[PDB]
Structure 1
Amino acid sequence: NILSSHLEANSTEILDDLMSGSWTEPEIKKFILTKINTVDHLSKIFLTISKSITQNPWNEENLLPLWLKWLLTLKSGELNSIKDKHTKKNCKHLKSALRSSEEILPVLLGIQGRLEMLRRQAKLREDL
């Protein structure tokens, strides 16, 4: 349906950001896997999603990161072999954009502990 519209648009020649938008429109998990299973080659979906997740490594939408993790689950026998000239610095800047969350997961878990302590002692001292 709309997954087929996004498939045809992303397969023809153009409209890759609008293609990921149309993929984010219906946005099924099963159809998300099916759109990776159907196509035989990509027009540097890894490159455009690399620049999107590089420019927003902190977005509340799970759509493009879900698409990236299923692309890397199902097609990484070929993403390491499609291209290795711009794709090398692509994966380099993607990894360096994403390593900071591994750097700051402990402070966020610490602040989560802080806030749970504060809210639970405030629920405790509730003035009878």
Structure 2
Amino acid sequence: XXXXXXXXXXXXXXXXXXXXXXXXXXXXXXXXXXXDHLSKIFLTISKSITQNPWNEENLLPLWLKWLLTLKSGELNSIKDKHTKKNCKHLKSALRSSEEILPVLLGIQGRLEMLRRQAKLRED
């Protein structure tokens, strides 16, 4: 309802995915995932997530999750011309974060290490 009208509007739109992103439901994220318009979603999704690896909203990465899990086979062969150039871009776009997730977990330890010694200064 919120997402179906946005799907008809993208069937002409990244603001449509941001506007159906006002729902934030995972069951709706699976149901609107099946209803090749999912590539018409992915053509905004791939660009928006490559432009931002650090977006702290959830429905665009979870929507990429439900798209890469629900549409896992056919997304490779929509096109081998112009989606896959961006696909060879996004492997570089994301795994930069994968390198520092061990380090970010390291400092995640290194913070509560000092939280606990400040609590020990309290007692």
Q: TM-score, normalised by structure 2?
A: 0.91
- Work out whether residues 3 and 23 of structure 1, in 8 Å CA contact, stay in contact via their aligned partners in 2: yes
The CA deviation at 1:43 is 4.9
Quote the Cα distance in structure 2 between the aligned partners of 1:69 and 1:43.
14
Say how many residue pairs are matched: 123
Q: What is the aligned partner in structure 2 of residue 9 from structure 1?
A: 9
Deviation (angstroms), 1:98: 0.2
Give 2:22's aligned amino acid. E
Aligned twin of 1:41: 37
CA contact 2:10–2:16 (8 Å) conserved in 1: yes
Task: Give, as a single letter, the amino acid of the residue that structure 1 aligns with 2:65.
Answer: K
TM-score, length-normalised on structure 1? 0.88
Determine what percentage of the aligned residue pairs are the same residue.
Answer: 71
1:111–1:44 distance in 2 versus 1, CA, 3 Å? same
SS of equivalent to 1:119: helix
Give structure 2 stretches of 5+ with no counterpart. none
**17, 20, 44: which is aligned to 1:20?**
17
1:37 offset after TM fit, Å?
1.6
| Paired residue secondary structure (1:76) | coil
- Per-residue displacement from partner, 1:85-124 (whole Å, max 9, x unpaired)? 1112111111110001111011111111111110001001
Looking at structure 2, the residues matched to 17 and 124 of structure 1 have their Cα atoms a distance apart, in angstroms, of: 51
Separation of aligned partners in 1, 2:61 and 2:87? 14
d(CA) in 1 for partners of 2:44, 2:79:
14
| Equivalent in the alignment of 2:113 | 117
After TM superposition, the runs of 4+ consecutive aligned structure 1 residues lying more than 3 A away are 40-44
Aligned partners of 1:44 and 1:105: how far apart in 2? 31
Q: Distance in 2 between matches of 1:54 and 1:69?
A: 15
Q: What is the deviation of 1:10?
A: 2.0
Q: Deviations over 1:4-57 (max 9, x none)?
A: 22122122x1xx21111122111211111111122x533532222111001111
Amino acid corresponding to residue 77 of structure 1 in structure 2: G
Gaps of 5+ in 1: none
